[PDB]
Write an enzyme that holds these catalytic residues in place. Structure first.
Site, PDB file in Angstrom:
ATOM      1  N   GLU A  98     -13.215  -6.071 -13.436  1.00 52.86           N
ATOM      2  CA  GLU A  98     -14.251  -7.078 -13.630  1.00 52.86           C
ATOM      3  C   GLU A  98     -14.413  -7.401 -15.096  1.00 52.86           C
ATOM      4  OE1 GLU A  98     -14.509  -3.971 -13.356  1.00 52.86           O
ATOM      5  OE2 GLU A  98     -16.493  -3.131 -13.841  1.00 52.86           O
ATOM      6  N   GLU A 104      -9.901   3.703  -8.696  1.00 48.31           N
ATOM      7  CA  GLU A 104     -10.606   2.434  -8.632  1.00 48.31           C
ATOM      8  C   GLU A 104     -12.130   2.698  -8.631  1.00 48.31           C
ATOM      9  OE1 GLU A 104      -8.418   0.231  -9.085  1.00 48.31           O
ATOM     10  OE2 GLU A 104      -6.550   1.074  -8.215  1.00 48.31           O
ATOM     11  N   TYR A 105     -12.940   1.741  -9.090  1.00 47.39           N
ATOM     12  CA  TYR A 105     -14.381   1.979  -9.131  1.00 47.39           C
ATOM     13  C   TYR A 105     -14.933   1.973  -7.740  1.00 47.39           C
ATOM     14  CZ  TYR A 105     -15.449  -3.084  -8.722  1.00 47.39           C
ATOM     15  OH  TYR A 105     -15.555  -4.396  -8.303  1.00 47.39           O
ATOM     16  N   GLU A 144     -10.918   2.348 -13.131  1.00 47.02           N
ATOM     17  CA  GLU A 144     -10.524   0.944 -13.254  1.00 47.02           C
ATOM     18  C   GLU A 144     -11.751   0.000 -13.340  1.00 47.02           C
ATOM     19  OE1 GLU A 144     -10.613  -1.050  -9.622  1.00 47.02           O
ATOM     20  OE2 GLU A 144     -11.588  -2.246 -11.233  1.00 47.02           O
ATOM     21  N   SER A 172     -19.561  -2.871 -10.599  1.00 47.62           N
ATOM     22  CA  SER A 172     -18.936  -3.921 -11.394  1.00 47.62           C
ATOM     23  C   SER A 172     -19.984  -4.864 -11.994  1.00 47.62           C
ATOM     24  CB  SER A 172     -17.927  -4.719 -10.537  1.00 47.62           C
ATOM     25  OG  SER A 172     -18.529  -5.233  -9.343  1.00 47.62           O
ATOM     26  N   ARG A 173     -20.937  -5.303 -11.179  1.00 50.87           N
ATOM     27  CA  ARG A 173     -21.965  -6.208 -11.667  1.00 50.87           C
ATOM     28  C   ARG A 173     -22.792  -5.543 -12.733  1.00 50.87           C
ATOM     29  NH1 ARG A 173     -18.995  -7.380  -7.172  1.00 50.87           N
ATOM     30  NH2 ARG A 173     -20.557  -6.533  -5.738  1.00 50.87           N
TER      31      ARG A 173
HETATM   32  N1  LIG Z   1     -10.281  -4.933  -3.120  1.00 53.72           N
HETATM   33  C1  LIG Z   1     -10.423  -5.081  -4.434  1.00 53.72           C
HETATM   34  O1  LIG Z   1     -10.120  -6.135  -4.992  1.00 53.72           O
HETATM   35  C2  LIG Z   1     -11.020  -3.884  -5.229  1.00 53.72           C
HETATM   36  C3  LIG Z   1     -11.405  -4.063  -6.550  1.00 53.72           C
HETATM   37  C4  LIG Z   1     -11.950  -3.051  -7.329  1.00 53.72           C
HETATM   38  C5  LIG Z   1     -12.146  -1.806  -6.763  1.00 53.72           C
HETATM   39  N2  LIG Z   1     -11.779  -1.612  -5.425  1.00 53.72           N
HETATM   40  C6  LIG Z   1     -11.977  -0.265  -4.845  1.00 53.72           C
HETATM   41  O2  LIG Z   1     -10.747  -0.006  -4.157  1.00 53.72           O
HETATM   42  C7  LIG Z   1     -11.016   1.139  -3.327  1.00 53.72           C
HETATM   43  C8  LIG Z   1     -10.522   0.692  -1.990  1.00 53.72           C
HETATM   44  O3  LIG Z   1     -10.948  -0.589  -1.821  1.00 53.72           O
HETATM   45  P1  LIG Z   1     -10.112  -1.570  -0.879  1.00 53.72           P
HETATM   46  O4  LIG Z   1     -10.747  -2.905  -0.976  1.00 53.72           O
HETATM   47  O5  LIG Z   1      -8.637  -1.442  -1.007  1.00 53.72           O
HETATM   48  O6  LIG Z   1     -10.450  -0.876   0.544  1.00 53.72           O
HETATM   49  P2  LIG Z   1      -9.489  -1.198   1.826  1.00 53.72           P
HETATM   50  O7  LIG Z   1      -8.474  -2.262   1.621  1.00 53.72           O
HETATM   51  O8  LIG Z   1     -10.450  -1.330   2.940  1.00 53.72           O
HETATM   52  O9  LIG Z   1      -8.639   0.162   1.840  1.00 53.72           O
HETATM   53  C9  LIG Z   1      -9.194   1.498   1.754  1.00 53.72           C
HETATM   54  C10 LIG Z   1      -8.388   2.455   2.717  1.00 53.72           C
HETATM   55  O10 LIG Z   1      -8.421   2.017   4.119  1.00 53.72           O
HETATM   56  C11 LIG Z   1      -7.385   2.724   4.795  1.00 53.72           C
HETATM   57  N3  LIG Z   1      -6.954   1.926   5.980  1.00 53.72           N
HETATM   58  C12 LIG Z   1      -7.127   2.281   7.266  1.00 53.72           C
HETATM   59  N4  LIG Z   1      -6.627   1.335   8.073  1.00 53.72           N
HETATM   60  C13 LIG Z   1      -6.132   0.372   7.301  1.00 53.72           C
HETATM   61  C14 LIG Z   1      -5.501  -0.841   7.570  1.00 53.72           C
HETATM   62  N5  LIG Z   1      -5.281  -1.211   8.824  1.00 53.72           N
HETATM   63  N6  LIG Z   1      -5.093  -1.614   6.541  1.00 53.72           N
HETATM   64  C15 LIG Z   1      -5.308  -1.223   5.287  1.00 53.72           C
HETATM   65  N7  LIG Z   1      -5.916  -0.073   4.996  1.00 53.72           N
HETATM   66  C16 LIG Z   1      -6.336   0.743   5.973  1.00 53.72           C
HETATM   67  C17 LIG Z   1      -6.266   2.894   3.757  1.00 53.72           C
HETATM   68  O11 LIG Z   1      -6.032   4.279   3.675  1.00 53.72           O
HETATM   69  P3  LIG Z   1      -4.744   4.976   4.312  1.00 53.72           P
HETATM   70  O12 LIG Z   1      -3.414   4.195   3.863  1.00 53.72           O
HETATM   71  O13 LIG Z   1      -4.758   6.396   3.889  1.00 53.72           O
HETATM   72  O14 LIG Z   1      -4.891   4.613   5.897  1.00 53.72           O
HETATM   73  C18 LIG Z   1      -6.883   2.439   2.421  1.00 53.72           C
HETATM   74  O15 LIG Z   1      -6.584   3.335   1.330  1.00 53.72           O
HETATM   75  C19 LIG Z   1     -12.547   1.276  -3.279  1.00 53.72           C
HETATM   76  O16 LIG Z   1     -13.028   2.235  -4.250  1.00 53.72           O
HETATM   77  C20 LIG Z   1     -13.012  -0.067  -3.733  1.00 53.72           C
HETATM   78  O17 LIG Z   1     -14.325   0.169  -4.257  1.00 53.72           O
HETATM   79  C21 LIG Z   1     -11.208  -2.636  -4.665  1.00 53.72           C
END
Ligand SMILES: NC(=O)c1ccc[n+]([C@@H]2O[C@H](COP(=O)([O-])OP(=O)(O)OC[C@H]3O[C@@H](n4cnc5c(N)ncnc54)[C@H](OP(=O)(O)O)[C@@H]3O)[C@@H](O)[C@H]2O)c1
Ligand SMILES: NC(=O)c1ccc[n+]([C@@H]2O[C@H](COP(=O)([O-])OP(=O)(O)OC[C@H]3O[C@@H](n4cnc5c(N)ncnc54)[C@H](OP(=O)(O)O)[C@@H]3O)[C@@H](O)[C@H]2O)c1
Lengths: 284, 283
Positions: B121, B91-92, B118, B165-166
């Site tokens: 956007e 993911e970015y 990825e 993304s922006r």
């Molecule tokens: N959110 C989107 O729509 C989106 C879109 C484009 C790119 N991204 C990219 O996606 C990557 C991760 O983003 P994200 O939004 O998914 O971050 P996130 O939901 O905060 O998750 C990142 C990590 O947090 C850990 N974590 C620890 N405690 C957690 C809990 N209670 N619940 C869920 N996760 C927990 C997980 O790792 P473990 O399972 O190993 O604990 C998970 O892999 C980043 O590079 C972000 O830039 C996200």
């Protein structure tokens, strides 16, 4: 925001979906403006959209795009009238029920400087997304596609090779240009079955059958055999999503000139290739 | 004939990925989700089993890794899975430095695998629209503001990266850009990043990322052309399976359905952006 004026001709199944897509917010639709519809019947107003006469629709400078969504038999008549009146045209498949008519109409669009576009939502279905990917690596030994449905009035949707040109389009899109080896047809008044035999350029047999009769649930059955193995089913690959919208989007891209000459030519060639086979089939 | 997949990091991103793999879709027909890897001990998400990083790198069964963890650990995981012989979706932003990205691309190339950043956007409806509006035009001046809640820089990195993304919009819509200046305000729980870019035809683009408490995630956009201007994206409907759509691009790469010309153009763009994020972080 500069929007093209659209009128939808023929408010049936196809027509309703187009109006609904125009009226809902989408990228494609942002460029369009539904000014009204044309029907043989006196409907008044569908969703605050007004009915308007063929006469006033051809007249109008406001109206720049005609969506032709009537039964296949009247397609050719309407396309010609709207192209002559100076409008761009989107028409649902089959664009015509003869090769020569298609040729004339493309040539007219070309001369009048407008876009003519045969809709092909079948190329936008999930089932096809998958097949596009599965076939990619392969060399086809033999193959077959059967489509069943309820009876269909040939006087208004035309001969089955035309009404089901979508199935042919799959086979052509997946396996290149095809040639006719034979074609049989059983009729019985309210049933009918059309059995076609095609070959690919590398000379490998494809079988195509359309069955239409009462009590028959609309369905598709497909079996491909390659040097590497076979495919007896498309697996569950989810439900189709906005196939019509997606086709509108291609149309708008045409209106905006976002496709190359190379590309527009490939498509024209393919469409005519199919229309021609439908005809070749109907002869035999 | 399915590729074995494992999802590393079960967060917001990772959930979506697992759901899309589990559901029936053309993409998914070509994949097989074997398990996930988490720093935490979850057991089993939807009948999918937790599996160790160790056993995940070992396994001949696992051929693709989806890295969905915080941006900070991306570079670590990518390297390990590429070394272990696996294709990688990340993911970015794929990394928080230009140099790292170059190495990892070069590693994939040498190991013969697909590495994929990825970019959902680019699959949004809002962008579908802009892609069409911009087509005919010559941009005088333009500006893009994105607001959101606070984000832990230690784990999602500097804003130019977390909001790449922006940038990728502006670059995709208006070609390669150069940096004229970049300022940044902080008050620890608030932050605002003001960037100034120019296009090859030397016309000014302003890019602002604002992150603070009580701020509703939002995008504001204003373009001026020689012909006229655009102050809003109109209502263009809601986004639809942007993640799945990205997976689809990934699988097409797994099947070699893209050309060299195309894959090159994409690598160039990705690095162009990672580079700008860096040049901005400097200034
Ligand atoms: N959110 C989107 O729509 C989106 C879109 C484009 C790119 N991204 C990219 O996606 C990557 C991760 O983003 P994200 O939004 O998914 O971050 P996130 O939901 O905060 O998750 C990142 C990590 O947090 C850990 N974590 C620890 N405690 C957690 C809990 N209670 N619940 C869920 N996760 C927990 C997980 O790792 P473990 O399972 O190993 O604990 C998970 O892999 C980043 O590079 C972000 O830039 C996200
Ligand atoms: N709809 C689809 O799923 C689909 C998919 C692919 C291709 N197509 C093509 O699209 C074209 C139309 O197909 P369709 O399924 O939309 O045809 P349809 O539903 O049978 O309607 C065709 C025409 O019937 C007239 N009509 C007469 N009585 C009607 C009634 N009671 N309800 C609705 N319409 C009535 C309408 O013309 P007036 O309003 O002037 O009376 C309408 O344009 C055909 O060429 C077909 O090959 C359709």
């Amino acid at each position: 925001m500069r929007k093209f004026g659209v009128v939808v001709v023929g408010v049936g199944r196809a027509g309703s979906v187009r109006m609904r897509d125009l009226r809902n917010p989408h990228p494609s639709s942002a460029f369009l403006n539904l000014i009204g519809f044309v029907s043989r019947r006196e409907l008044g107003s569908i969703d605050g959209v007004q009915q308007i006469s063929l006469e006033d629709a051809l007249s109008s400078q406001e109206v720049e795009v005609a969506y032709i969504c009537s039964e296949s038999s009247s397609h050719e008549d309407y396309i010609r009238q709207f192209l002559n009146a100076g409008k761009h045209v989107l028409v649902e498949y089959p664009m015509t029920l003869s090769l020569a008519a298609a040729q004339e109409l493309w040539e007219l669009a070309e001369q009048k400087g407008k876009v003519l576009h045969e809709e092909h939502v079948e190329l936008l279905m999930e089932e096809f997304a998958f097949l596009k990917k599965e076939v990619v690596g392969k060399d086809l030994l033999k193959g077959s596609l059967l489509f069943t449905a309820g009876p269909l009035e040939e006087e208004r949707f035309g001969f089955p090779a035309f009404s089901g040109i979508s199935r042919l389009t799959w086979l052509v899109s997946l396996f290149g240009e095809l040639s006719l080896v034979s074609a049989t047809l059983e009729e019985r008044k309210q049933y009918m079955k059309m059995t076609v035999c095609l070959e690919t350029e590398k000379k490998s047999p494809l079988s195509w059958i359309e069955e239409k009769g009462p009590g028959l649930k609309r369905n598709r059955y497909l079996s491909f055999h390659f040097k590497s193995g076979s495919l007896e089913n498309v697996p569950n690959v989810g439900v189709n999503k906005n196939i019509f919208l997606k086709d509108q989007n291609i149309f708008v891209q045409k209106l905006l000139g976002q496709f190359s000459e190379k590309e527009l030519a490939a498509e024209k060639k393919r469409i005519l290739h199919c229309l021609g086979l439908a005809e070749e089939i109907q002869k035999y």
